[PDB]
């Protein structure tokens, strides 16, 4: 299948409560494999998936050096951005960064990513050409000028096309029994009267991996987008995800409704109905 690696950095100032916290977590697809938290009692890169544990001490020491240095760099960056927006020293602010590489179903680089946000708003992003930047505002234009001067894009491109893909392929092989296994959803439909003339049909998908899935209700073969309550896909805590989609239907019309399920783990998409 298709696979991606992503690192997610969050740097958060907290005036009056010490220096900015830096967290980094690393994912392959929907599986976290490392964390680093500058607030930990003894900050170090820690494994979060069994398949990463076999990496040697040099790997862990190098990761920890990077994240420790990042802890300091992001503190400087937070000060810089406060200044770019003429903000007071009183408020708490957040820089977020997500970056990484996507491979197609043949292990080839599909595209790279390096995007940043400030206080939850797009700030600056490396364009898909891995060569130029898109800055959200005049503040981010300052960062852009700095990064253009420091050959930043060139260095990220090298990473994204090189080490990013190499490592991702290594992880995919080392964790092949899980990372390259798609678990299909276990599905069922439940029925709950809401009154004398209506009932809720709820289509369930449980135990699936990865998280990407499509759950839809049709009435007489027509998608019921507007009338379907779709909850956010949620983690079960055992690596798998859950989702449901509900529709309220006239009593006696239940058989006119069909739930449709698509998931990488399914050769054949599913069509389900309530089975009283």
């Amino acid at each position: 299948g298709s696979h991606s690696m992503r690192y997610f950095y969050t740097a958060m100032s907290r005036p009056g409560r010490g220096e900015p916290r830096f967290i980094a977590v690393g994912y392959v697809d929907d599986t976290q494999f490392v964390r680093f938290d500058s607030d930990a009692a003894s900050p170090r890169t820690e494994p979060r998936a069994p398949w990463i544990e076999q990496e040697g001490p040099e790997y862990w020491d190098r990761n920890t050096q990077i994240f420790k240095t990042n802890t300091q760099t992001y503190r400087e960056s937070l000060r810089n951005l406060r200044g770019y927006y003429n903000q007071s020293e009183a408020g708490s602010h957040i820089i977020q960064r997500m970056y990484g590489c996507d491979l197609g179903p043949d292990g080839r680089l599909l595209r790279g990513h390096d995007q940043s946000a400030y206080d939850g708003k797009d700030y600056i992003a490396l364009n898909e050409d891995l060569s130029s930047w898109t800055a959200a505002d005049t503040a981010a234009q300052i960062t852009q000028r700095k990064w253009e001067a420091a050959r930043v894009a060139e260095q990220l491109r090298a990473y994204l096309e090189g080490l990013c893909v190499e490592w991702l392929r290594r992880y995919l092989e080392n964790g092949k029994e899980t990372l390259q296994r798609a678990d299909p959803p276990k599905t069922h439909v439940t029925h709950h009267p809401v009154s004398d003339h209506e009932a809720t049909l709820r289509c369930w998908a449980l135990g699936f991996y990865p998280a990407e899935i499509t759950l839809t209700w049709q009435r007489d073969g027509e998608d019921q987008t507007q009338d379907t309550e779709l909850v956010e896909t949620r983690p079960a805590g055992d690596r798998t995800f859950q989702k449901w989609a509900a529709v309220v239907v006239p009593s006696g019309e239940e058989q006119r409704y069909t739930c449709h399920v698509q998931h990488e783990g399914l050769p054949k998409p599913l069509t389900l109905r309530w089975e009283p």
Partner: peptide, 11 residues
């Protein structure tokens, strides 16, 4: 493995 950009990625 993360990128080692700590020495140049100051915003």
């Amino acid at each position: 493995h993360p990128v080692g950009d700590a020495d140049y990625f100051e915003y």
